[PDB]
Structures are given as structure tokens and as C-alpha cells.
Write a protein that holds these residues in place. Structure first.
Motif, PDB file in Angstrom:
ATOM      1  N   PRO A  22       0.810  -1.231   0.000  1.00 16.35           N
ATOM      2  CA  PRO A  22       0.000   0.000   0.000  1.00 16.35           C
ATOM      3  C   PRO A  22       0.835   1.268   0.000  1.00 16.35           C
ATOM      4  O   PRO A  22       0.519   2.209  -0.733  1.00 16.35           O
ATOM      5  N   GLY A  23       1.893   1.317   0.804  1.00 18.20           N
ATOM      6  CA  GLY A  23       2.713   2.507   0.921  1.00 18.20           C
ATOM      7  C   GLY A  23       3.736   2.703  -0.168  1.00 18.20           C
ATOM      8  O   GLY A  23       4.450   3.712  -0.154  1.00 18.20           O
ATOM      9  N   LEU A  31      -0.846   4.067 -12.282  1.00 12.62           N
ATOM     10  CA  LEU A  31      -1.950   4.883 -12.788  1.00 12.62           C
ATOM     11  C   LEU A  31      -1.523   5.717 -13.991  1.00 12.62           C
ATOM     12  O   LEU A  31      -2.262   5.817 -14.988  1.00 12.62           O
ATOM     13  N   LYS A  35      -2.455   5.738 -17.577  1.00 16.09           N
ATOM     14  CA  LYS A  35      -2.744   6.952 -18.328  1.00 16.09           C
ATOM     15  C   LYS A  35      -1.957   6.950 -19.637  1.00 16.09           C
ATOM     16  O   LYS A  35      -2.474   7.350 -20.674  1.00 16.09           O
ATOM     17  N   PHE A  38      -3.604   4.684 -21.994  1.00 16.16           N
ATOM     18  CA  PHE A  38      -4.795   5.360 -22.513  1.00 16.16           C
ATOM     19  C   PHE A  38      -4.420   6.357 -23.610  1.00 16.16           C
ATOM     20  O   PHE A  38      -5.178   6.589 -24.548  1.00 16.16           O
ATOM     21  N   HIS A  42      -5.720   5.559 -27.991  1.00 18.86           N
ATOM     22  CA  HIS A  42      -6.333   6.612 -28.783  1.00 18.86           C
ATOM     23  C   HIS A  42      -5.374   7.090 -29.871  1.00 18.86           C
ATOM     24  O   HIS A  42      -5.785   7.369 -30.993  1.00 18.86           O
TER      25      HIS A  42
END
Lengths: 78, 49
Positions: A22-23, A31, A35, A38, A42
Motif C-alpha cells: 500500500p505505501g 496509474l 494513463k 490510454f 487513442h
């Protein structure tokens, strides 16, 4: 076809890398990584449109010839 | 009051453990929502561009 499995596997790897660490900082790069992925899909998909755009142009040239012949024959008949 | 203070002085461990456990979850709680927010933000803005 390859990119799709990778984003999906990462989605699944991002799901449990939260519990495994988690840390850890690497979650926000994932992420971002997500991104970046992503940004790529496109970007890659947009490659097709210019070719697609060119195809639209040919019918206009093609349809008029299909229309002009009819007018001439109709006029001849009249 | 002094007697209550000096009796709790050795009973300051479990309360600290509960407090740090609650903070961990709370600290973590900000993190999950933030990740969700980032995903939500990307769909709304990044996808449109």
C-alpha cells in the motif's frame, strides 16, 4: 490485440499491488502507466482515420460519373 | 486527578495502538479514493482530448 491484454493484466495487477504494497510509490506510476496506455490506444486508433478519410473522397468522384451517364442517356431518350 | 494520570501512565499503550491503527486506515482511505478520483478525472478529461 497485444495492448488489450496488457492494459487488462495491469488492471488486474494494479488491483492486488495495492494489498501487496500500500505505501509503495509505484501505484501512482501504474496509474500514470495506465494513463500512458490510454494515451497510446487513442493515438494508435487515430491512425486509421486518415486512410478512412481518403476513401470518402473516391466515391464523390465515382458517383458523379454514375450520375452523369444517366443524365446523358435520359437526354438522348427524350 | 494526579492519581488518575499516574494510573493511566502505564495504560498508554493500547490507546496508542488503536489510534495508529485508525490513522493507518484513515491514511489509506485517502489513498484509495485519490486513485479512484484520478481514474474518474482521466475518463472525463483525457478521453475527450
Amino acid at each position: 490485440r497485444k495492448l488489450n491484454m496488457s492494459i487488462l493484466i495491469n488492471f488486474l495487477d494494479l488491483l492486488d499491488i495495492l494489498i501487496r504494497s500500500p505505501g509503495s510509490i509505484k501505484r501512482e506510476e501504474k496509474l500514470e502507466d495506465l494513463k500512458l496506455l490510454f494515451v497510446h490506444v487513442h493515438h494508435l486508433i487515430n491512425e486509421y482515420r486518415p486512410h478512412q478519410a481518403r476513401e470518402t473522397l473516391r466515391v464523390m468522384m465515382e458517383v458523379q460519373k454514375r450520375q452523369r451517364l444517366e443524365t446523358a442517356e435520359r437526354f438522348q431518350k427524350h | 486527578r494526579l492519581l488518575a494520570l499516574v494510573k493511566w501512565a502505564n495504560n498508554a499503550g493500547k490507546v496508542e495502538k488503536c489510534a495508529m491503527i485508525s490513522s493507518f486506515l484513515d491514511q489509506q482511505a485517502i489513498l484509495f479514493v485519490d486513485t479512484a478520483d484520478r481514474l474518474a478525472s482521466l475518463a472525463r478529461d483525457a478521453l475527450v482530448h
